[PDB]
Amino acid sequence: CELLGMSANVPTDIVFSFTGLMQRGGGTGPHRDGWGIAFYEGRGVRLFQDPLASVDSEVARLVQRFPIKSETVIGHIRQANVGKVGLSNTHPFIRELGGRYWTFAHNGQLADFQPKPGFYRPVGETDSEAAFCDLLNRVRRAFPEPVPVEVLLPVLISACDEYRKKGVFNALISDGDWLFTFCSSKLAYITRRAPFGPARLKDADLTVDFHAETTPDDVVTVIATEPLTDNENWTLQQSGEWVLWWGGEVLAK
Template sequence: MCELLAMSANTPTDLCFSFTGLTRRGGVTGPHKDGWGVAFYEGKGVRAFHDADASARSRIAEVVQTHPIKSEVAVCHIRQANVGDICLANTHPFIRELWGRYWVFAHNGQLRRFRCPEGFYEPVGDTDSEALFCDLLNHLRRHCHRDSPRDEVLAWLVRLSAAYASEGVFNLLLSNGDWLFSYCSTKMTSITRRAPFGPARLKDADLTVDFAAETTPDDVVSIIATEPLTTDETWDPYQPGEWRLWRKGEVIRSGQGPVRPD
C-alpha cells in the first residue's frame, strides 16, 4: 500500500518537517519506493514535484525537504506499486482543472477491477487511482456546477467515496485549493497543532523541531497522514468510513456516512 500526507493551515506554512519523515518511508524505513509526488497550492496555482524514483534517494525530494515552500494546502504521496507500471505518469498526486480551479488527488488503496467509464476526464497512466480520480470528477461535472453549494459537492464526494470503498481499499485526499477532503477506508490519522506550541520528534528520522520558535500564537496547522509521523504527540485516528473536510487548519464538516444538513 502507499502512504498519504496532507497539510491544511490558516497561514502559509512549509511542509519540510513532515515531508522529511515521510520520505524516509520511501525506501528506508518503509517499502514505498515506487515513486512520490507533492503539490503545494499558492493561491489558485499549484507547484508540483513528481519523481518515479524512491523518495528516500531522490535529489528532487532533497530540494523539497530543504526549501521551505509556503502553502495553506499541500498533498503528498509515496507509492508502493500494485496496479500500473513504475513511471512518472503513475505518480500521485494527480491534477486536473475543474470550474477554474486545479483539483489535486492522492489515493492509498486498491480497486483492481475498477475501470473508468468514458467521460470528459481520462487517465494518462494505467493506475486504478487515476481512473478513480477521473471518474469522480466526471460525476461532479455531470451532477454539480461551479456555483453549487459546498455541501452539495461534499455530499457527492462522500457518496462516491463510500461507493469506491465498497469495492476495495479507498483512502483519499482531495483538494481544490480552498478546502481539503479526506476519506478513510482503512487507515488515516491527523494532528492539529495550535498554541501553545511545543517540540515534536520524527519517528523515521533523527529530527526534532520546536514549533514554538517557528510559529505565531495565531497559527493553526493540521497534518493528515496514513500513519503518525512523530513519536511524542497524540494523533487522532480516523474510523473506517469516516470523512473530514478541512479548511484553514480546522475540521469544518465531518461524519461517517452521508452528509447531514447543518
C-alpha cells in the same frame, strides 16, 4: 506513513528531508519508493513527484531545497511498486475544475474498477487516477457551475462510498481551499493550536519538520496514514469516516 496532508490557517513551513539512500535491512536500500508532494501558493499549485528510483534524483533534491510554506499540502510517499512504473503513474494527480486546481492522493487497491469514460481521462494506467477522473466527472455533471463546498460534498462522499465497495479507498482531495479526507483502511490526524513549538514527524527514511507558531492564532492540522509522532492528540479515523478541513478546522464530518 503513505498519505500525508496538511490544512493550516496561515502559510506554514514544512521541511521534507528524504534520508539519502543506504544499504539496509529492508525498505529503501539501493532503491527508493515513489513519492509525491503537492502544495498551494494561493490558487497556484506546486508538484514534485518521482516514481521508483535507484538513485537520489534531482526532483528528490528539489523538494528538499525549496523553502515550502503553504496552507494545503497533499502527498503520497512510498507508493506501492505494484503494477506499472513511470511518472504518469505517480501520485498525487492534478486537474482543474471550476477554475481551481484539484489535487488527489489515493492509498489502497481497487478490484474490477471500470468507470465510464467521461470529460476527464487518466493519462496513466493507475486505478487511483481512473478514480480521480471519475469522481471529477460526477462533480462536473452534477455541478456544471462552481458551487459552495457543502453542496458538492454529498457527491464526494457518494463516489468514495462506491469505490470502497471495490477495495481499499483512503484518499485526500483538495481544491486548494479545503482538504477532503476519506478513510477506508486507516488514516489519522492531529490539530495543533497556537502556541505550539517545533515538531518533527518522521518515517523510517523521511523527516518532516514543523516550526513554532507564526501568529497567536495559528491552527495547523496534519493528516497521515498513521501517527508519525508518539500519540498525543492523534485521533484515529475508522472505515467510512470522512472529514472536511479548511483553515486547519473541521468544517464537517
